């Protein structure tokens, strides 16, 4: 059974628009890499002190709509947003896969 909510990612860079930048990033092989860190609670009498990381890779996806072009259109990157029982604070670090 799934978590609610996804993380949706794009990037913006001055001088160009977002959609063609995402199209170029997909066409050149780039894929976001996401690292989630969870922070423990104050109540250590009810939860344990352990601190957890999870490393994921964002999946490309198309935006449903008119899409005049044949193949590619508005494009975004998506990953699930997981949360564990015992925390309310998570740090999400996004970086590139090198390509």
């Amino acid at each position: 059974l799934s978590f609610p909510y996804y993380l949706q990612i794009n990037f913006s860079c001055p001088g160009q628009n977002i959609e063609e930048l995402a199209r170029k990033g997909h066409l050149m092989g780039m894929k976001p890499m996401v690292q989630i860190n969870y922070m423990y609670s104050v109540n250590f009498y009810r939860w344990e002190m352990e601190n957890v990381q999870i490393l994921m890779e964002a999946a490309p996806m198309r935006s449903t709509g008119y899409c005049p072009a044949e193949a590619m259109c508005v494009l975004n990157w998506y990953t699930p947003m997981p949360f564990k029982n015992g925390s309310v604070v998570s740090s999400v670090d996004i970086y590139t896969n090198g390509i």
Binding site: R23, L27, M28, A69
Partner: protein, 236 residues
């Protein structure tokens, strides 16, 4: 070309004047390309393709003249041959060779098109665009992504743009792959585009010089030459 004494000069006029009924009048070379198995010569009196190069039979190249309906002598003097320089050494089964020819014309009742392309046995020359109108400066077949790239420039306007269209059964299609990239209005005149050999880099040149990574959805200017145009390019 390390010595001028070893560059041997040949005249081919007898072989050309064979295929042409009578005898016309100004057979200069206009362009020539050398594919992996073929020799394509565009001269002022027409376009000729060698039969093949891997099978010697008569110790003389036999050239077959292509058909173009009407195009006369004034249509061949303004004509360019575009070819992607790619080495097919061990010749995998999926690798083929294409050649594009581009004229500058008026649209007669006998033609319509001014841009043709053909596959490895250079016999069936079919048009590059199918069913005000833009003029195709350069059409290039890219095999990494199986697509065709057009460099359009509508006359009576400064508008210049590039369209990438998917290929269906070896023939380019309508409905571009991704929305076209429009160059700025300062781009005075384009003169062509080139693929760097054995690579996936695109280079549009003319009054300015632009480079594109990936397929050609996004470009980035690297040079501007006000009222000056590059005429030719050499790369290795």
């Amino acid at each position: 070309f390390w010595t001028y004494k070893e560059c041997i000069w040949h005249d081919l006029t007898e072989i050309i004047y064979a295929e042409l009924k009578d005898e016309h009048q100004g057979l200069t070379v206009i362009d020539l390309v050398l594919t992996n198995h073929f020799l394509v010569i565009l001269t002022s009196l027409g376009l000729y393709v060698s039969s093949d190069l891997r099978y010697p039979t008569t110790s003389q190249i036999k050239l077959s003249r292509a058909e173009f309906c009407g195009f006369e002598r004034v249509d061949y003097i303004r004509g360019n041959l575009w070819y992607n320089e790619k080495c097919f050494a061990n010749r995998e089964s999926f690798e083929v060779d294409y050649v594009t020819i581009t004229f500058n014309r008026n649209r007669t009742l006998s033609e319509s098109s001014s841009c043709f392309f053909s596959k490895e046995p250079f016999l069936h020359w079919l048009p590059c665009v199918f069913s005000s109108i833009p003029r195709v400066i350069t059409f290039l077949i890219d095999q990494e992504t199986d697509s065709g790239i057009y460099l359009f420039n509508v006359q009576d306007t400064k508008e210049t743009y590039v369209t990438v269209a998917m290929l269906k059964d070896g023939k380019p299609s309508p409905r571009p792959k991704f929305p076209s990239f429009h160059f700025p209005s300062t781009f005075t005149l384009p003169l062509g585009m080139i693929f760097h050999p054995r690579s996936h880099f695109l280079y549009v040149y003319g009054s300015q010089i632009w480079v594109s990574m990936d397929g050609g959805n996004t470009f980035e200017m690297l040079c501007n030459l006000f009222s000056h145009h590059v005429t030719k390019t050499s790369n290795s």
